[PDB]
Amino acid sequence: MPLFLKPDDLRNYRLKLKDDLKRASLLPVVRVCCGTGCVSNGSMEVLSALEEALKGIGKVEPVVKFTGCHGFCERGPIVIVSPGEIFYQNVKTKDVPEIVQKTILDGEVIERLLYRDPVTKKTYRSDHEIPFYANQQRLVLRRSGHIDPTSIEDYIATDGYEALCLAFKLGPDEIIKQITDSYLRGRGGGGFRTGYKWKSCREVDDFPKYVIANGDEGDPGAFMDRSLMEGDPHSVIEGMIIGAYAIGANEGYIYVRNEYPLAVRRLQIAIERAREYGLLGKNILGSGFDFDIQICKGGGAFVCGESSALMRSIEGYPGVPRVKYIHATEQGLWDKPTVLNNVETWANVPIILMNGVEWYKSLGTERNSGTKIFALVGKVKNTGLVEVPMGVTLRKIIYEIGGGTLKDKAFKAVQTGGPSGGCIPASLLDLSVDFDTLVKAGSMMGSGGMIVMDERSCMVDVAKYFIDFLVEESCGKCTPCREGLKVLQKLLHDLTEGKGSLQDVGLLEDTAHELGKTALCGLGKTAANPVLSTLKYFHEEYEEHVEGYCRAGVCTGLFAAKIDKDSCIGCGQCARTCPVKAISGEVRGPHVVDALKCIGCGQCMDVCPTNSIASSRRVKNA
Amino acid sequence: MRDPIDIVIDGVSLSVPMETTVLEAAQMAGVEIPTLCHHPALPPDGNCRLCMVEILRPGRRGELAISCMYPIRAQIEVNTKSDEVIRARKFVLKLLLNRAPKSARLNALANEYGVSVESRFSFDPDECVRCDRCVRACETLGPSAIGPAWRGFNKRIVPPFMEPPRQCIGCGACADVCPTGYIECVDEGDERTIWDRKFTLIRCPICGQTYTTEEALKFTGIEDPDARLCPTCRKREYASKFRIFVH
Amino acid sequence: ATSDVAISDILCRYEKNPRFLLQVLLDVQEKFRYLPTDAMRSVAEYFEIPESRVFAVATFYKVLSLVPKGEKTIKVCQGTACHLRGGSQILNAISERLKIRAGETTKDGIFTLETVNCLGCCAMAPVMMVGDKVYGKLSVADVARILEAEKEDAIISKA
Amino acid sequence: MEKVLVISPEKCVGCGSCELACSLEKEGECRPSLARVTVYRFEAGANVPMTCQQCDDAPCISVCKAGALARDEKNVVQVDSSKCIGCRMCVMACPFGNMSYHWEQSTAIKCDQCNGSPYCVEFCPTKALDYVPADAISLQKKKEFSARFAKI
Numbered sequence A: 001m002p003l004f005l006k007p008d009d010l011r012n013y014r015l016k017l018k019d020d021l022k023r024a025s026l027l028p029v030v031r032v033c034c035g036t037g038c039v040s041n042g043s044m045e046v047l048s049a050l051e052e053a054l055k056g057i058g059k060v061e062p063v064v065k066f067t068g069c070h071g072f073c074e075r076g077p078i079v080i081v082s083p084g085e086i087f088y089q090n091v092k093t094k095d096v097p098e099i100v101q102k103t104i105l106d107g108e109v110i111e112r113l114l115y116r117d118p119v120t121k122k123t124y125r126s127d128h129e130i131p132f133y134a135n136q137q138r139l140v141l142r143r144s145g146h147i148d149p150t151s152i153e154d155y156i157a158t159d160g161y162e163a164l165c166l167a168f169k170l171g172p173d174e175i176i177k178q179i180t181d182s183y184l185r186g187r188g189g190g191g192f193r194t195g196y197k198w199k200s201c202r203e204v205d206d207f208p209k210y211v212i213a214n215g216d217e218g219d220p221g222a223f224m225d226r227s228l229m230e231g232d233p234h235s236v237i238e239g240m241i242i243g244a245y246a247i248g249a250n251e252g253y254i255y256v257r258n259e260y261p262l263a264v265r266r267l268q269i270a271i272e273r274a275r276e277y278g279l280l281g282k283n284i285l286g287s288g289f290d291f292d293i294q295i296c297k298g299g300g301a302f303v304c305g306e307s308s309a310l311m312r313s314i315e316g317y318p319g320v321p322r323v324k325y326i327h328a329t330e331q332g333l334w335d336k337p338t339v340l341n342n343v344e345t346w347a348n349v350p351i352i353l354m355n356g357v358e359w360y361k362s363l364g365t366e367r368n369s370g371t372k373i374f375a376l377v378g379k380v381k382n383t384g385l386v387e388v389p390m391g392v393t394l395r396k397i398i399y400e401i402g403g404g405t406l407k408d409k410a411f412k413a414v415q416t417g418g419p420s421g422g423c424i425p426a427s428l429l430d431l432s433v434d435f436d437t438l439v440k441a442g443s444m445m446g447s448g449g450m451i452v453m454d455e456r457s458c459m460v461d462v463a464k465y466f467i468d469f470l471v472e473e474s475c476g477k478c479t480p481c482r483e484g485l486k487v488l489q490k491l492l493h494d495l496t497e498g499k500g501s502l503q504d505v506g507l508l509e510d511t512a513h514e515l516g517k518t519a520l521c522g523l524g525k526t527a528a529n530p531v532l533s534t535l536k537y538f539h540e541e542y543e544e545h546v547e548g549y550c551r552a553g554v555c556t557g558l559f560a561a562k563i564d565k566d567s568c569i570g571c572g573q574c575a576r577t578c579p580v581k582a583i584s585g586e587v588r589g590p591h592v593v594d595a596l597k598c599i600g601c602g603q604c605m606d607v608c609p610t611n612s613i614a615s616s617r618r619v620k621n622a
Numbered sequence B: 001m002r003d004p005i006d007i008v009i010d011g012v013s014l015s016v017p018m019e020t021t022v023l024e025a026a027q028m029a030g031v032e033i034p035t036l037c038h039h040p041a042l043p044p045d046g047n048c049r050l051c052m053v054e055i056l057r058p059g060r061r062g063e064l065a066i067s068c069m070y071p072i073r074a075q076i077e078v079n080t081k082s083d084e085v086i087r088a089r090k091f092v093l094k095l096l097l098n099r100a101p102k103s104a105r106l107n108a109l110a111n112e113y114g115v116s117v118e119s120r121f122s123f124d125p126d127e128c129v130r131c132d133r134c135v136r137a138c139e140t141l142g143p144s145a146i147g148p149a150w151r152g153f154n155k156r157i158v159p160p161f162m163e164p165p166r167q168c169i170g171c172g173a174c175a176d177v178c179p180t181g182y183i184e185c186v187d188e189g190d191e192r193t194i195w196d197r198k199f200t201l202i203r204c205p206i207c208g209q210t211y212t213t214e215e216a217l218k219f220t221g222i223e224d225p226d227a228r229l230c231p232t233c234r235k236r237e238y239a240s241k242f243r244i245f246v247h
Numbered sequence C: 001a002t003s004d005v006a007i008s009d010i011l012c013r014y015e016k017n018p019r020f021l022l023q024v025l026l027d028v029q030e031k032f033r034y035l036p037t038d039a040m041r042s043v044a045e046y047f048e049i050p051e052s053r054v055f056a057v058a059t060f061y062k063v064l065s066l067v068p069k070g071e072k073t074i075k076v077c078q079g080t081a082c083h084l085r086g087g088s089q090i091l092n093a094i095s096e097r098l099k100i101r102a103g104e105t106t107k108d109g110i111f112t113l114e115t116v117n118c119l120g121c122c123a124m125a126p127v128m129m130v131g132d133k134v135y136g137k138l139s140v141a142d143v144a145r146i147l148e149a150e151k152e153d154a155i156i157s158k159a
Numbered sequence D: 001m002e003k004v005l006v007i008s009p010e011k012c013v014g015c016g017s018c019e020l021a022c023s024l025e026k027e028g029e030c031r032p033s034l035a036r037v038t039v040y041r042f043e044a045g046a047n048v049p050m051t052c053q054q055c056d057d058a059p060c061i062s063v064c065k066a067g068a069l070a071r072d073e074k075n076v077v078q079v080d081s082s083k084c085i086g087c088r089m090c091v092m093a094c095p096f097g098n099m100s101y102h103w104e105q106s107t108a109i110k111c112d113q114c115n116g117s118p119y120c121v122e123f124c125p126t127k128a129l130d131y132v133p134a135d136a137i138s139l140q141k142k143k144e145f146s147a148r149f150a151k152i
């Protein structure tokens, strides 16, 4: 292990690594996406198969390694062969010998394994020309999908820990001055300025001090923080060293979940690589600043992401939020000064100090600089990690990047921020996605996960789902979140079952408004945002659900299907799907559904290829 | 000592010291604010969210804050009988009353605020408002026997592992600090049953009276045999040692 | 006897620092599939912390259970993407086929139906995890094959 | 302490007016069981009153953990009834039984010298209870006994 006593040693070792990379540019490196989305999709098998297949090729076998999330999670297992810098999608074990023999050996690019645009009918050889990728600015995730997250050599050769060398020359005052002037606002959804947090932690003279990385990702449907911690933990470690040298902290903690074995193991491996190399421990790079990182791994709890609850969970207590009027930068972990930023906020610090403040502010809008990582999921054609500059319109993320809704159903809403945010209808698709603009609309940037709803998503059911999640994730400390959430769940279960009334809707809005202004922590205060957003923008659905009709066809028994007699192709998949066999149609011809015979369950509507069946109002007359 | 700050509560001007809660300012100014979870002897938690007041700042709108914990560090105007305050108190009172309908305290508060029990929104009424008063009293006493054991609407204050507490003392302070009377401490003869555990009481040798358990007296570490006497009997026994000289 | 030896090994791995309470409880969960009263009492004694704090930490997280789970745990995702794709139908199908509810073990002590907030595989939704294997893009019909195959393989694997 | 309660059991006649005065001042009604002073009547007319003497090293303060027991500026051990949780440890710790518990009000009760105006002293007909400055705690009894030698 090379222990860099001096910054000159780090610079020279990086020079040697770059020199070897230059000589190894001709080597056919194969990198396999081993992030959570593709490991679950069966990419480890492809990794092992490629490792076995490359054995016995020439005197020097082609290199094979694993990487983090490449970004296009909808593509499944992704292997990137460096000999031609070729993007391969949906790679299976059957395709391993063919990939080796044709691409790695014969140089033949497999046409059927390349990405094809479903819109323009074009095949893309490389990842940079993919429309999903072409409309992104991958700045924080620049190394993810191209390096081995466990190999600090890849990180160093890619200008890693060099911003730490710059920070050691700048000094603690200049680092904090450059952070504030970069307008780096916290990427954990709050949007608070990172520079103010670091400065207000340096001002207080109570020692010791700590820096924390909130690797908890409590938002359901969001994985950008986990994918960052798995793609490159060293961009988090370096951030935690810069932010500690700036504020004088000597200890560092990364708070993650035990439910993330990949992230935990890769973060621990990265730390073990850092302490070997002298970047963590004692007398780092001959600067007299000793700093060491640990990893507190908790269980799965939404509230534990909250700062005050995160401190308690680290200390060895249940992660129950506590009401405090003194910020965590003055009395945080063990009542000591503590800087808590999420892993994406920490990862921007090396970018800020490496590429400069002026370059960092050149991105995004005014007061909202840099980039943001979005976990675009839901009903979108394209699902994965989307990183875009601030100020990008939601229409871009959902249509140019996302490709639109699944199949071709009409776009209805986009839930931003998760259970702590609100839905935005199709009318407001030209809003900038920076911090302030989404707040103005009543939604919230929040975690970053964007959920796309189409015509088959009932907004009453969406609000009920979010309320159920917040009921099961409430810590139960304070009366509003403990009980008013149960009241909202009762009201929303009445509406989805046809047992509602207009007075129920009015009481729902009143209860949401009173819950927002009376809860203790951020879970309860923002718990009413989905309900309030659905009420504000989709009140017609609430009125129809009061009348007993669900226009989205989600709430069971509140609708009757209607088969089109023009666009129906007579495939009969709906007939084979109906549990009560209430579908009677011409063989290889238009079909007909009996309103009285149908009960309404939605099984048929999701399998029609023509999308010719939708909800119709029930006949209560007979 | 810092310079006191002048604040106005419902049109009443008063100079309160630094780092003083709004509830203390209302108490010294004669203003009444309803509270459920706050206990002056226990570390405050801010659970019930029932002591809501409006804080109006120069150039800023009124916002709801809990008077039992919100400190007075700047020049603010506090309003306790505002419409928004009344709505928030009605909401919290409805929730608490539906949780504990048989409670006298919550029913009195509802009668004060015109709140009635609703049958539709009464899920599992078990007479516990989760104010954490008993847990904090137990913690401050020294034996940390009881504690919360779930999250969400299923949160409950239980002995550890749902068994007769192995660190309980029998003092009965947890039952004393309880707004809804959910905890029961029954004494029959020389037995005290609290948290479904039986504690043996102490009888003074000349009175037959009881004021504490054997476990409590062993916990306090008072080895004087007079500690087993009841206060009246002990006082009489000590007073007998005074040989008054009538001459 | 051997159970106390395992508890002693797990306790002797970590320091006498109460901040390691949750990690010790997770190691005990992985050793025993649930949290006993005796092991949790030894955990409380080792850190010199009250038992009620250990019980609060143990029952605060839905991962830690007070009764043993099955040999294989079925984690059905209930994330926003999976719910939008039809995760409620998948959960209801598994519940009705196994005649159990969420967070409930079957009578044979083989399957423990559990719901997870997210798995990171939202592209392949609805997604289900049995043991450590992840199944995605699955309908109601696919559930019937997966469950009985995993049960018949579980009995073979254990014995 | 500026002033102290001085008990002379030789002067006591056992009328019990001290208990009634203390209970009237504290509980608002004549209830001798809740008085902070108790007079005990023994054989041969030997009545001795007993009340809290504000021990300078008070076991009751040493045993309380809710912070409800503290010495004020006038060296009087005071109970903060709002801080009392009812553990009754101060009741066990007092070696003389001068600390009781008011179960209806849920607070420990002890003599507080009425914050400087003792009613038991005011309504004692024989001065068996007196309120004298601490610097002359035993001067009056000593002078009364010494006067027996001056009449010689």
Ligand SMILES: NC(=O)C1=CN([C@@H]2O[C@H](COP(=O)(O)OP(=O)(O)OC[C@H]3O[C@@H](n4cnc5c(N)ncnc54)[C@H](O)[C@@H]3O)[C@@H](O)[C@H]2O)C=CC1
Pocket: A186, A188, A189, A190, A191, A192, A196, A197, A200, A216, A217, A218, A219, A222, A305, A306, A307, A327, A328, A329, A340, A341, A417, A418, A420, A421, A444, A445, A446, A447, A448, A521, A522
């Ligand atoms: N998975 C995720 O990332 C999720 C994130 N969220 C987001 O969390 C946000 C709520 O954050 P909160 O911590 O409740 O509140 P907040 O937004 O007021 O504060 C955010 C952060 O800024 C710090 N901070 C604020 N003012 C400060 C000051 N003057 N000095 C120093 N530090 C200061 C806080 O301590 C905290 O670390 C919401 O916007 C929500 O969207 C919520 C749910 C999930």
Ligand SMILES: Cc1cc2nc3c(=O)[nH]c(=O)nc-3n(C[C@H](O)[C@H](O)[C@H](O)COP(=O)(O)O)c2cc1C
Pocket: A185, A186, A187, A188, A189, A190, A191, A192, A214, A215, A216, A217, A218, A219, A302, A303, A304, A305, A306, A307, A340, A341, A342, A343, A345, A521, A522, A523
């Ligand atoms: C209920 C709740 C859950 C939260 N979950 C997370 C989370 O999973 N990840 C995160 O970075 N912040 C989460 N937060 C936000 C934290 O309170 C805090 O803002 C974060 O630890 C630091 O944010 P920053 O990176 O903007 O400084 C959550 C907040 C609340 C109220």
Ligand code: SF4
Pocket: A303, A321, A473, A474, A475, A476, A477, A478, A479, A480, A481, A482, A519, A520, A521, A522, A523, A524, A525
């Ligand atoms: S709002 Fe909900 S999560 Fe937050 S402290 Fe109150 S009960 Fe707990």
Ligand code: SF4
Pocket: A563, A564, A567, A568, A569, A570, A571, A572, A573, A574, A575, A585, A591, A607, A608, A609, A610, A611, A612, A613
């Ligand atoms: S599934 Fe659609 S196209 Fe096929 S028979 Fe039914 S209605 Fe017609």
Ligand code: SF4
Pocket: A560, A561, A577, A578, A579, A580, A581, A582, A583, A593, A598, A599, A600, A601, A602, A603, A604, A605
């Ligand atoms: S909604 Fe259900 S019952 Fe009605 S036609 Fe479709 S599958 Fe059959």
Ligand code: SF4
Pocket: B127, B128, B129, B130, B131, B132, B133, B134, B135, B157, B177, B178, B179, B180, B181, B182, B183
């Ligand atoms: S048992 Fe009583 S004191 Fe304890 S939380 Fe419940 S209501 Fe409060």
Ligand code: SF4
Pocket: B137, B138, B141, B143, B145, B146, B165, B167, B168, B169, B170, B171, B172, B173, B174, B175, B194, B195
């Ligand atoms: S009686 Fe037992 S549980 Fe209640 S406060 Fe006393 S020691 Fe704690």
Ligand code: SF4
Pocket: D011, D012, D013, D014, D015, D016, D017, D018, D019, D039, D047, D049, D120, D123, D124, D125, D126, D127, D128, D129
């Ligand atoms: S009032 Fe005086 S004389 Fe009467 S009982 Fe009390 S101390 Fe004795």
Ligand code: SF4
Pocket: D051, D052, D053, D054, D055, D058, D059, D060, D061, D077, D093, D094, D095, D096, D097, D098, D099, D110
């Ligand atoms: S209560 Fe008892 S121990 Fe305490 S000061 Fe009075 S006499 Fe002394």
Ligand code: SF4
Pocket: D063, D064, D065, D066, D067, D068, D069, D079, D083, D084, D085, D086, D087, D088, D089, D090, D091, D107, D108
């Ligand atoms: S009974 Fe009250 S005054 Fe006496 S020790 Fe207990 S808390 Fe303190």
Ligand code: SF4
Pocket: D021, D022, D023, D025, D035, D036, D037, D051, D110, D111, D112, D113, D114, D117, D118, D119, D120, D121
């Ligand atoms: S001084 Fe006051 S409190 Fe003390 S015994 Fe006399 S009347 Fe009672």
Ligand code: FES
Pocket: A033, A034, A035, A036, A037, A038, A039, A068, A069, A070, A071, A072, A073, A074, A076, A078, A384, A385
């Ligand atoms: S996990 Fe592989 S592309 Fe996202």
Ligand code: FES
Pocket: B034, B035, B036, B037, B038, B045, B046, B047, B048, B049, B050, B051, B066, B067, B068, B069
């Ligand atoms: S009394 Fe203040 S929140 Fe309960």
Ligand code: FES
Pocket: A220, A221, A222, C077, C078, C079, C080, C081, C082, C083, C117, C118, C119, C120, C121, C122, C125, C127
């Ligand atoms: S929503 Fe199911 S894996 Fe994320």
Ligand SMILES: [Zn+2]
Pocket: B204, B206, B207, B208, B209, B229, B230, B232, B233
């Ligand atoms: Zn007695």
